[PDB]
Amino acid sequence: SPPVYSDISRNINDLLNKDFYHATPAAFDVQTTTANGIKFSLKAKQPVKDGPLSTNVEAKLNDKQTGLGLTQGWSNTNNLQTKLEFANLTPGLKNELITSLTPGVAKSAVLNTTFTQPFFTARGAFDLCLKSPTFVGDLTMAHEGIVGGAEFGYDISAGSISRYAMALSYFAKDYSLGATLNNEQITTVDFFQNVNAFLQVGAKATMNCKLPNSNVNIEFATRYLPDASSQVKAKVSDSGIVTLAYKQLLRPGVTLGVGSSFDALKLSEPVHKLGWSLSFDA
Amino acid sequence: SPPVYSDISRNINDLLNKDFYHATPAAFDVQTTTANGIKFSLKAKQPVKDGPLSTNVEAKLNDKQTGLGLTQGWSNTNNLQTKLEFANLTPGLKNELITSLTPGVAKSAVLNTTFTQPFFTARGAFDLCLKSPTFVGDLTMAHEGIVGGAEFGYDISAGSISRYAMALSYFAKDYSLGATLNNEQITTVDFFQNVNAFLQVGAKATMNCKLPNSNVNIEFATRYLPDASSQVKAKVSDSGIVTLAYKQLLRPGVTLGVGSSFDALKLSEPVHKLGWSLSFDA
Amino acid sequence: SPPVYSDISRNINDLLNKDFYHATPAAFDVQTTTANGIKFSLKAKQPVKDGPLSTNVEAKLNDKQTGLGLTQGWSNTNNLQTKLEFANLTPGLKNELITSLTPGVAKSAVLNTTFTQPFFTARGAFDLCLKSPTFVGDLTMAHEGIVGGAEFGYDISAGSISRYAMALSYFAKDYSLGATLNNEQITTVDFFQNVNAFLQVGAKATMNCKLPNSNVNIEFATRYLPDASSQVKAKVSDSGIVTLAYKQLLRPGVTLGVGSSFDALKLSEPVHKLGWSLSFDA
Amino acid sequence: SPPVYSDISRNINDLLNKDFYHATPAAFDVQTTTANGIKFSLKAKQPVKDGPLSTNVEAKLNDKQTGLGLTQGWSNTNNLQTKLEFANLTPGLKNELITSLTPGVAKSAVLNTTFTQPFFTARGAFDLCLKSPTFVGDLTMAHEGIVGGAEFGYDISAGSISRYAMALSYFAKDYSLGATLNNEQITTVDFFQNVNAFLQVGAKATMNCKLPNSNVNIEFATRYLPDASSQVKAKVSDSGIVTLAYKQLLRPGVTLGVGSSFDALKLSEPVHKLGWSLSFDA
Amino acid sequence: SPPVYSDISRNINDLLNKDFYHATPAAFDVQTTTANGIKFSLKAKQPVKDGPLSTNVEAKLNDKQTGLGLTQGWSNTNNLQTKLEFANLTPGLKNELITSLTPGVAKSAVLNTTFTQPFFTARGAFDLCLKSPTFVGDLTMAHEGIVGGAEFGYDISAGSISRYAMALSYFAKDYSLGATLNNEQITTVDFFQNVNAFLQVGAKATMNCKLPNSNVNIEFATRYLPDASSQVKAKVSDSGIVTLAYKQLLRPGVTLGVGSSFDALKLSEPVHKLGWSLSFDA
Amino acid sequence: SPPVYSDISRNINDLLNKDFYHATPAAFDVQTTTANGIKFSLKAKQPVKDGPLSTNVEAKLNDKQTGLGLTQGWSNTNNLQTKLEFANLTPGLKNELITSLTPGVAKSAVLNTTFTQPFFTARGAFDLCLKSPTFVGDLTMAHEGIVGGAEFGYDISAGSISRYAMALSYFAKDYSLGATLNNEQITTVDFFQNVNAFLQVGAKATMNCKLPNSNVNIEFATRYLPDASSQVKAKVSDSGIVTLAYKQLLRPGVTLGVGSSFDALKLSEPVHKLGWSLSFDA
């Protein structure tokens, strides 16, 4: 099945968003399942090293039936997030919806409809509650590994098109190259090369075609697995930011993560990021 | 028989308010039972780190006879809390009474009647030996899995309802979800989950629905058993309060517990309470 | 037969009064029995490390032939205390006579008459020599285990009662309770329990109803036997006064005892002290 | 192999400086390994006045693959210590590197090197990255059972030495004497004796030859094993400081130690301490 | 071989100056022997109630080889002694030395030569390392039971005789008398008697003829053995000083002693001294 | 064989001058013998309770050979009291002599000669040293139980008779009456009546024939012997002086005596004479 627009070239942005523990100095995740399968979890993060500790509790369930689902998330700041997944009649056509109920912050309900069919993937977006009807449509076609994609943020209230973005990639067994153009001023390219099951390497460049300011922005990210129960991966950028991350498996079920961010060829400077994470799983 | 309302969600209440030793730096318990069947005890606690040495001695008996159950006890606070259980005529009609006899300070007697029926629980309490008597009652109903109930309180002196609460839970084979609301002002949703025979985990969130205050007060506790004669448990609140506890059974009949009270992101201020306890049993 | 009034609650009054070697820093007891049958003894006490040394020698004998019993005393103060015990009148009525001859202080003589019958016990004491006739008596009954008595002191010169106390206890197979009320209030409630041959525990509370809204002094003492040739025991109190004692039988005939009494909690007051005791036998 | 200098009289120091937990009133450490050999460890202490906490976590590994060593630690003060050990350049010469990283305190790095070979061993240290290199070196030789060593520190800023010591030991099967001479006219003469598997005694006396005013101190400590899962220590200093320690092994995998240190014969100065320690091992 | 002059009437001197514990309130001895021949010791006495805890450690060896013997004692109060005993060339000619090295105080070593012949004893002591050397020499003869001898002290600096004493004693099977004269100013007569293996008794009288009032002070001592593992002994002088002592072996290698010192004349003055001693042996 | 003068009417003198422990508040006698036969003893008596303690040491020997004997005594008052006994040639004719060497008090040497032959016992005592030679002669005849006696003191320096005493008694199986007259001014009549082996009674009166002052004084002395290991005996005189004494045998070899004295014509509280006495024996 062809990937969805959000999942095109997921392998490259997956190597610089996940398993990075340099942003939150502390992290505390607990996951647990029950007999019938209702998953529950609690996450505790800390953005500022000398500030409060944010915590959210999530209750998500799925079923191998026609596709009913329900997710209820409740954080410290009380933005209750509810999900609803179902297809029922039409197979492959899921109807998802997300809300954010808050006594202080205005609620925002988003309706997503995804139709899955070979060589064709499209997604709808409907905004409710607040008076701002926007349809963030997107289309994706797959032709012998060539994956195309177009995103358009058409505004009903204004009557015009806000965002117009294009993307084109080519998937293969152990290599995939893609590119994207956002509103014809941001150009992004990637070079993902999978070495083997024990090593991954990727590159991501933002050419940013714009005559007033062109500069250069490149990132090289690696991922090395010494063995099954370990992981170490680091990225490097031209600005000197070199971030390292080390994920270790303690007693089977609990994982520990250490992340750090050094700045090369800039002496030491009075700034540095380092943090740890402790994830449990029943 | 459905559980009494006052004893609803005892599973979650026993994770964060029971078998914790951090409020008293030292404690001494002795539990002796005579051949007659009177169980004598002693509790030598210590509330203040450099103050008085609190100690109490109590006796009680519980026989499978017609139901004469007597309990008494003295303490260092110069008060007595006697207890008297009996059924006699009606089976299941528990008529308990609690006194707070104290020299000088006016005593108060609380007379409780608990009457059980299949799928019905009713408990009432009269506050006698007081110039301003009060009555408090509660009701509990069962729905073959949905255990609900409520409580009301009537002031005899005033002539109206003083405190109205309503609770509704959902028991299952290995998890339980409940929620209680009092005065439309305090709200508490609990959660208890038995992973397996050797691990328990639960959460409790008090939201306090009101416009002036913000955020929420949530808590998360676990309980682990390395084997029969051990118990290690830990709880964490959103404020960073992390309390540990570890009870160990050295000799058969002798238990030793320890406990700390850390503070995430505050290792520079003396707030950390820490204590131990020795309990003996013949 | 009902116990004497002074022997009421002897199992508890004796548990926390004897074998505590903390008051005297030194002790030297020699007991020898001569061939004729008189029992000589020599006690050597010394209160406080620097100061006087008290030496007491006495010789006592009992004859089961006719019931004559004589005791001869001699202290370092050069005073003699005799004790003549005899009945020779009827089975169930014996009299005792005690003198306190001292060259400097006026000698005093006391005549005690004890007359004991099934279910009734009474005795009286007189005060001769010095012009102060005081008659102290008591009367105890026993109704199948419940043992209650009362004592009173009448002054002939004054013409009224100077002290009026009443005690009531409930003995059993292995535990005993009881409450005594002296002249004003000082209502004292005790508790003694003999769990097995290798451990005894006990408590003793004094309500002191004379002063309303005040503290209450309670004590709790144990007694443990590691084997048949040793003893160790301890007592606590609400003021933190903790007393330990250890009696070891070094060789048959010679026993040693080490006792300390440190004030726990606050370890700043110099009130710890320490004492030992040696007892011989021939 | 000849003993290295720090191992000279290592038994004496490991007798009166180890397992004496009377200083810190609390200690909690967890030791655990992973699927591969990493051996995480977490220690947490507490000073006397229940002030801050001193917690750190470290992971050391000794890979037998071409003799690799790595020890990275992390304390709550953002203090990271890195230890690198390797010997793959010459058989019999191993190189160590110790680093310290922390924002506030200046960064430090010492390069250690040890040259070992039969009948000859020497060390060398370079405390660099401080704008003041201090060469700390020493060497020791053994002939037939008598070992002797010497230290020296030469500074390039002053052009001379600032500290030198001369050691002389006579090891044997079960006892070892020893004598050190420090440039401050300090002479420590010590002896260690291992009478049997259940008892070890030792003594150590320091003589200050700089000030000949009877300034001689002498301590001695013992180590007894009542069984194979217990340990009792006792150290007596000349000033009357007596230190006790009792390491009891609970269920195999957890140890608990209780230490106390008072001043004998002077129970008036607040110099006595009591503390405990819990060691968990997975 | 006849006893040396210092060893005449050692039996009486081992009654009133041995195995008494009325001097030091507390003492602690441990004696350890390695499987080489070296014997260590750790003594911890206490001179007065307000003095430092005295401590010394000595090690000595006595080999059945050619005769080399070394004794070295490191003390706390800078009163070290070292002894060197050997015979080597002549069998029986013992050449000992004693040192009193003290930092600050001029040491005074003494060189002792002892020659034993049948019916001839000659001992000479040279006081070297002193500005005013002395020489103390004594001779001892024996006539089939009557043991006599004399001692003279010649001053090298002066050239005269300072100390001139004689002694004459009669040893027998179970008793021994003897009178010694010192400078025709001090005359003493002793008496030692051995009733049987379970009892000893002796007396000592000093007259001091160079006194106008004489005031002869005699002493009478006993020694009783209740069994193999006990030793009770008491002595009494004219002024009523009655000192008791009791040595008991609790475990094999562990001995305990208790000593007291009465006055038996005046009992309102703190003249009484008291003490205990606990010695160990491996 | 007829009794010597000093032994006539000794039975009555034995009931008032022996086993009366009322004069010395404290006594301490130790007697010991040796396998060959020289008896040694040490006595310690205290005349006044607030004074010093006098002590003497005696060494006396006797043999079944021709009759040589030697006694040597030495006390605090420094008197070398010696006794020399010998007969050699003539059997029965002993020649005793007593001296008292004292540096301060003049020596006194007395020579006693006693010739023993049936029906004739005479004694002569000389006087030496001091220049006041006397001769104390006495003669004694026995005729069928009638015992006469005449004592004369002739002064050599004066040439007259100073003391002229005449005694006459009649000994029998279990009764004896005596009468003596000294200087025709001192009349004494003795009446001893032996009841049996378990009781002795005696009386002694002194008429004192003198017209100016005649008065009367009589003494009745009893002695009760309960068994072999006990004795109790008292005397009563007409002067209001009654004294009691008790002798006990505690362990086989050691005796204990207690003496007391009352008063009838005076009574009062602060007049009492009591004292104890210990006497060992090897």
UniProtKB/Swiss-Prot annotation, chains A, B, C, D, E, F:
One of its GO terms (cellular component) is mitochondrial intermembrane space. GO terms for biological process: apoptotic process; cell redox homeostasis; DNA transport; mitochondrion organization; monoatomic ion transport; phospholipid translocation; positive regulation of protein import into nucleus. It holds the Pfam family Porin_3. It is found in: Mitochondrion outer membrane. CDD domains: Porin3_VDAC. The modification Phosphothreonine is found at T116. Transmembrane segments: none annotated. The modification Phosphoserine is found at S108. The keyword Ion transport applies. GO terms for molecular function: ATP binding; phospholipid scramblase activity; porin activity; ubiquinone binding; voltage-gated monoatomic anion channel activity. ATP binds at R10, K18. It comes from the Eukaryota. Keywords: ATP-binding, Ion transport, Lipid transport, Membrane, Mitochondrion, Mitochondrion outer membrane, Nucleotide-binding, Phosphoprotein, Porin, Transmembrane, Transmembrane beta strand, Transport. InterPro entries: Porin_dom_sf, Porin_Euk, Porin_Euk/Tom40. Consists mainly of membrane-spanning sided beta-sheets. 19 strands distributed along the entire VDAC protein, have the potential to adopt transmembrane beta pleated sheet structures, which rolled together may form a 'beta-barrel' type structure, possessing pore dimensions. Homodimer. Interacts with FCJ1. Interacts with AIM5. Interacts. Belongs to the eukaryotic mitochondrial porin family. Non-selective voltage-gated ion channel that mediates the transport of anions and cations through the mitochondrion outer membrane. The channel adopts an open conformation at low or zero membrane potential and a closed conformation at potentials above 30-40 mV. The open state has a weak anion selectivity whereas the closed state is cation-selective. Is the major permeability factor of the mitochondrial outer membrane. Catalyzes the scrambling of phospholipids across the outer mitochondrial membrane; the mechanism is unrelated to channel activity and is capable of translocating both anionic and zwitterionic phospholipids. PANTHER family: GH26960P-RELATED, VOLTAGE-DEPENDENT ANION-SELECTIVE CHANNEL. This is Non-selective voltage-gated ion channel 1. The gene is POR1.
